[PDB]
Design a protein around this nucleic acid. Structure first.
Length: 17
RNA sequence: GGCUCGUGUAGCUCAUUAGCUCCGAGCC
């Protein structure tokens, strides 16, 4: 919720803050 | 193009930290 909230960049590219 | 990769104080679900989109190194 209220946070970076992203995970992947749209193709399993992930986000890892 | 296209994929992987990756916080980019880049968006949506804003409670939920992952799942989709953006695009740079790489080949060219």
């Amino acid at each position: 919720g209220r946070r970076k909230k992203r995970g992947t960049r749209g193709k399993g590219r992930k986000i890892h803050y």
